[PDB]
Curated annotation (Swiss-Prot):
It comes from Homo sapiens. Expressed in the brain cortex (at protein level). Widely expressed with the highest level of expression in the brain (nerve fibers, varicosities, and nerve endings). In the brain, the regions where it can be mainly found are the cerebellar cortex, the neocortex, the striatum, and the hippocampal formation. The chain holds residues 1733 to 2671 of 3142 of the full protein. Belongs to the huntingtin family. This is Huntingtin. It is linked to Huntington disease: A neurodegenerative disorder characterized by involuntary movements (chorea), general motor impairment, psychiatric disorders and dementia. Onset of the disease occurs usually in the third or fourth decade of life. Onset and clinical course depend on the degree of poly-Gln repeat expansion, longer expansions resulting in earlier onset and more severe clinical manifestations. Neuropathology of Huntington disease displays a distinctive pattern with loss of neurons, especially in the caudate and putamen. Interacts with PFN1. Interacts through its N-terminus with PRPF40A. Interacts with PQBP1. Interacts with SETD2. Interacts with SH3GLB1. Interacts with SYVN. Interacts with TPR; the interaction is inhibited by forms of Huntingtin with expanded polyglutamine stretch. Interacts with ZDHHC13 (via ANK repeats). Interacts with ZDHHC17 (via ANK repeats). Interacts with F8A1/F8A2/F8A3. Found in a complex with F8A1/F8A2/F8A3, HTT and RAB5A; mediates the recruitment of HTT by RAB5A. The N-terminal Gln-rich and Pro-rich domain has great conformational flexibility and is likely to exist in a fluctuating equilibrium of alpha-helical, random coil, and extended conformations. It comes from the Eukaryota. A motif (Nuclear export signal) lies at residues 584-593.
Amino acid sequence: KNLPEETFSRFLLQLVGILLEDIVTKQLKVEMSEQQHTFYCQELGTLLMCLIHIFKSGMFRRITAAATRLFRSDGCGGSFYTLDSLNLRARSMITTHPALVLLWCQILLLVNHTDYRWWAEVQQTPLGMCNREIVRRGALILFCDYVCQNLHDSEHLTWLIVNHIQDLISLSHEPPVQDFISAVHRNSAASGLFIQAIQSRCENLSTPTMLKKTLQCLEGIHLSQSGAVLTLYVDRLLCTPFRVLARMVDILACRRVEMLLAANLQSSMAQLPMEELNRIQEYLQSSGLAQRHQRLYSLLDRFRLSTDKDWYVHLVKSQCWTRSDSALLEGAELVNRIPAEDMNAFMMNSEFNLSLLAPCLSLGMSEISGGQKSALFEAAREVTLARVSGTVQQLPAVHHVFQPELPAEPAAYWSKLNDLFGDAALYQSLPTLARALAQYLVVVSKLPSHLHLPPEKEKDIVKFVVATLEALSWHLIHEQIPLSLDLQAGLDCCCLALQLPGLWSVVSSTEFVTHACSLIHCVHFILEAVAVQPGEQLLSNPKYITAACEMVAEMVESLQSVLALGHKRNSGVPAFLTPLLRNIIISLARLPLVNSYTRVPPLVWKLGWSPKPGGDFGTAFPEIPVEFLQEKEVFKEFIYRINTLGWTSRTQFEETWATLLGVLRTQINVLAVQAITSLVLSAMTVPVAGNPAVSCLEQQPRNKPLKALDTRFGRKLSIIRGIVEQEIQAMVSKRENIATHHLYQAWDPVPSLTTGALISHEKLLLQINPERELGSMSYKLGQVSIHSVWLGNSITPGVDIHSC
């Protein structure tokens, strides 16, 4: 019993199917002409204009409902052109005929078929092919105009804004995406999600044409979300050097303050917090930004006020025993001239600002780097490490590995973790205690032995890198991003404990199999919930150990594609983590829990190689035999795993030496003389020598140390140009050496020379040769100058590196 609805709708959807099995699968000069191909792809152009007139004009009522029960339906046992067969033909129509794959985008929306498998290939959700950007930007102007019509479905609003951010803004002169944004300004909860996306994509919104299109879309947003547009107008986008992009973000930030005070004073204070308001004004005084823009600074002072020995002690309490302020560089100097016999009585108290404890550590280092020992920096190492222990004392006894896929399925262990740890008051401390351990571990390479971390308190700083990175994965499931500056403060406590020789050794032992496999689940969870758009991947024994072992193989192949600074695939990571997350995937696959599997290239596990592991751990595979390396595609992927990964204790250095010499058909003679170059240079490195995480290749200045210094006027010369050169490298230089975001990371790996200590950056003031970009550390034909050949090897006319 065939309906007349049913007879006429199988005839127009299987005549789209005849025209598309030809244009793909027919030869272009054999069966058809070219004058006969001007008119064969032009009969598919006026038959898709007949199908979007029946579904839109509404006069054809019965024909619209018939297709929706068919594209959802399978074919009759294969007797029809079914809807998954018809759509394989069209994605190979992408490239030859890109004007007719924009007409097939507007039909699939119109039938209620918004299926996220096909809509990701056409938009590339995380030089170029010139004929796809008509379709990639053409299917995103057509996917917004379907969202704007029926905006009641919130499932389609939250997909297109979180994923496509750099594309949603850069189209804003278009009549279907101009209407998508105004409804977001109408909607209360849909406006707040648009503003979390730009803070991740500020690294690409700096070119002068991409920033003029944000301010026309951040022009008028909802009044309940004008407190998140005023922390974005001050922190990120106002420091642009464009003086009509610093002038047009003065029109938009003074206008948020004026509509708020004529509004209710009740709803606006819960919108812009009293602790969050003090953070903003500390950014403007240490910089010159308040004195540049006068109109912005007048409006924020009126907001707050509507809402002598022992005399000196009381005045400093007003900004420290409080909730939060923006006085941080100004707050840190006041604590200095407390009489220095009593810091802990006046710092370790009920509620001292822990954001006045982490910038307290930076200023007392500058005193030590030049001169006398610091009452700022000695007594604030005592305060930092006592608060770290009690939270781990608040943690339970026996630790189980974090699992974001099946969290409550193991046990009721996670009942304690939401009440003693999951409190929103205990969570606030974990990014204030997280800036604390970031600045303390850096200066360890240049502190005296009074100031190094204790050996008994060394266990409790290993256990606390594990516990603050699990509060980061717990908000992405539930609430939002943590703060995305608190994405950035928690993964700096983790990058430094893996660089020190003390803290890295404790993570390797048998007692910490649960704590080293939980930094692998939680750095793969922050890298996948940011880079991998929904419906993708990164690139294209108990269970948890091999679920931690398979996790590290996937992430290292991304450093080619995903986390390489400036790739086409790196538009999705917001580029303040590509310094941070590149240095941290290296130093976790140097663990003896993991390292044996990671050197095996991925073409091997498709082939038949799987011996048994045993090392009193999970995976202790032997090294790869020579017979697999005799193929080039199999041999190009083993050399990748050994250079960016480095090596370990000296027994593992001679294992890779014997595998390459048996290779020494001429396509594999070329690529293995280049693999012997890279093994010697990891014995040439001046710290740990085999770790590309911490270190880089030693270089020698061929310029001698100067004569113009060392006089009484000459010692004055060295202090003045110490301040000028040091904030250049924060702006000008390339940070090849440095992962973290901190300021005074001046580090040049020139050794002393029979090698000795390392020379600091301030002592080699003008030694570095002019052949090299500032701070960019690589081979550039001048690493060892012949000054340094003759005084290490006295000739003038742990590995045995002399052996190799």
